[PDB]
Amino acid sequence: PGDPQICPKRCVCQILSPNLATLCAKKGLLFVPPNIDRRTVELRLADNFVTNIKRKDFANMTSLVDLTLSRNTISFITPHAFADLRNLRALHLNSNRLTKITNDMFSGLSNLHHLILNNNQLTLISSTAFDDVFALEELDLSYNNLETIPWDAVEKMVSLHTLSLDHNMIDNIPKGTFSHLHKMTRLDVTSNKLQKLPPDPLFQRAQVLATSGIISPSTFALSFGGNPLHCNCELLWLRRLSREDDLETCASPPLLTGRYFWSIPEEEFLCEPPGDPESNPAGE
Amino acid sequence: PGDPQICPKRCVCQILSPNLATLCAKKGLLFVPPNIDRRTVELRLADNFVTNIKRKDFANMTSLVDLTLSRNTISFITPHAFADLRNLRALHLNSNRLTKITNDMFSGLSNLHHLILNNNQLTLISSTAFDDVFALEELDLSYNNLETIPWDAVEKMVSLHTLSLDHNMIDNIPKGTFSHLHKMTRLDVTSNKLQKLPPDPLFQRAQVLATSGIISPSTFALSFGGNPLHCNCELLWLRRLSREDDLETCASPPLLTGRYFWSIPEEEFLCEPPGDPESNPAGE
Ligand SMILES: *[C@@H]1O[C@H](CO)[C@@H](O)[C@H](O)[C@H]1NC(C)=O
Ligand SMILES: *[C@@H]1O[C@H](CO)[C@@H](O)[C@H](O)[C@H]1NC(C)=O
Ligand SMILES: [Ca+2]
Ligand SMILES: [Ca+2]
Ligand SMILES: [Ca+2]
Ligand SMILES: [Ca+2]
Ligand SMILES: [Ca+2]
Ligand SMILES: [Ca+2]
Ligand SMILES: [Ca+2]
Ligand SMILES: [Ca+2]
Ligand SMILES: [Cl-]
Ligand SMILES: [Cl-]
Ligand SMILES: [Cl-]
Ligand SMILES: [Cl-]
Ligand code: NA
Ligand code: NA
Ligand code: NA
Ligand code: NA
Ligand code: NA
Ligand code: NA
DSSP, X not given: OOOOOOOOTTSEEEEETTEEEEEOTTSOOSSOOSOOOTTOSEEEOOSOOOOEEOTTTSTTOSSOOEEEOOSOOOOEEOTTSSTTOSSOOEEEOOXXXXXXXXXXXXXXXXXXXXXXXXXXXXXXXXXXXTTTOTTOSEEEOOSSOOSOXXXXXXXXXSSOOEEEOOSSOOOOOOTTTTTTOOOOOEEEOOSSOOSOOOOOGGGGGSSOBOSSSSOBOOOOEEEOOSSOEEOSGGGHHXXXXXXXXXXXXXXXXXXXXXXXXXXXOGGGOOOOOOOOOOOOTTOO | OOOOOOOOTTSEEEEETTEEEEEOTTSOOSSOOSOOOTTXXXXXXXXXXXXXXXXXXXXXOSSXXXXXXXXXOOOEEOTTSSTTOSSXXXXXXXXXXXXXXXXXSSTTOSSOOEEEOOSOOOOXXXXXXXXXXXXXXXXXXXXXXXXOXXXXXXXXXXXXXXXXXXXXXXXXXXXXXXTTOOOXXXXXXXXXXXXXXXXXXXXXXXXXXXXXXXXXOOOOEEEOOSSOEEOSGGGHHHHHSOOOOOOXXXXXXXXXXXXXXXXXXXXXXXXXXXXXOOOOXXXX
């Protein structure tokens, strides 16, 4: 309807026509203010103490595009809370207390290009949780407890140019995930449990080359440092890249344990014919 | 013995007589280097990826004073790991993955004046864990999951001048804890579950006073903001202090819900004679 504009007592509401924005940031709120005009395009709740997301909070916000909950203490989100936002392109949940991501949490958002989850305690993400977010251009999981993510849903995100997994428990990356993703310019796996990384043509751009007539800048940013790397032939493709030394370190095999990844010559990365690994490349 | 000095390959060892220091910081280590001279006074491991503390790591370090493990990913500490350090005055565990503090973890350290635990996932601290640390001048629990701490052990720390509890789940502070602690200059309870705060004479110094012939600086730093304050007569002593407005907010009673703590007049903080609280001050 054509009702007059609603603004919470503690917030500031801006109208730059047609758009309307509700800025509540750093007001000390313990919960989402009850009266927020449903026509708000941008909603800034960041740097508050809100602990809970009620179903009624964001209900019926059709034109809502940016929503920033960052730096709140949030342990719970009522199901179907975001179910009413079709137009939301960006959502910032970072620096909260979320321990889990359910299937129904993000289920409604088709138009979302940015999902920022970093600096939470999340130990788990449900299998279908990312099925509807396939339009994401940015996904930040950094600084969490995750040992795995819905890889099958991630390999279906075509336009994603940034994936930040750093500072997690992730022990494995499936081998074919990035094949169909040609927009990815950034992957940060730093401080994880990875013993191995899958080869991808994208990673061929993670090195600097020159003296061909042009000095080629690095067009892909990859950081694998801080992982318990098991150093064998499977990582040789990575050892062949010409890169800065980030102090990456091999966890295994025992003779390579403790030594810098780039300080090891290429000839000393060895796979053992048939238990390292385990018809591997030697053949059997 | 008089053995030659041991230094790890990746570290730098300084001798300023008599003292010896081993600086391993930011070397990318996945574990504590095995050879570290047992006579080291200061050991800097910060900004590494070490995940585990073995019994042998710090064993037999008698003269060790400062030990900084900060900004590591550490989920486990072998029992009796610190049992051999009598002279340790400072220990920095901050920014790690520790989820728990056992009874045997700190059991050995009498001389410890500084314990920095901030930015961990700790949900629990065992009842006797702090019994031996009674000499602590600084204890930083900030940014954790704690709902309670060994208050009985804390009220026995006489020389403690700083306690940082901020950004936790703590729902209650016992009423008599700070009575015997006259050295405390700082308490940060910000972003907790506290509905109430106990009155203490120390908190009488948390306000600024002037026009008596001297403008008195604030000699005690207290931050209670970001708590679900239940606003009744029990907090009146706090409302009487003349302080900056940090945007503290009452969670309850319903008529005070959402309103700024300092925007409420003193006459509107009311306790109800006999269920708020519950022979309370009205008498029964
Ligand atoms: C959402 O919309 C429905 C109908 O469109 C209405 O009944 C309900 O009260 C609305 N809720 C909010 C929080 O606006
Ligand atoms: C610690 O000292 C004991 C005896 O003093 C010795 O047997 C043991 O090997 C030492 N361990 C380390 C790690 O220095
Ligand atoms: Ca964009
Ligand atoms: Ca495929
Ligand atoms: Ca393709
Ligand atoms: Ca690790
Ligand atoms: Ca000191
Ligand atoms: Ca007492
Ligand atoms: Ca006394
Ligand atoms: Ca809170
Ligand atoms: Cl927090
Ligand atoms: Cl974390
Ligand atoms: Cl970490
Ligand atoms: Cl935290
Ligand atoms: Na906050
Ligand atoms: Na946080
Ligand atoms: Na390994
Ligand atoms: Na680190
Ligand atoms: Na951390
Ligand atoms: Na309350």
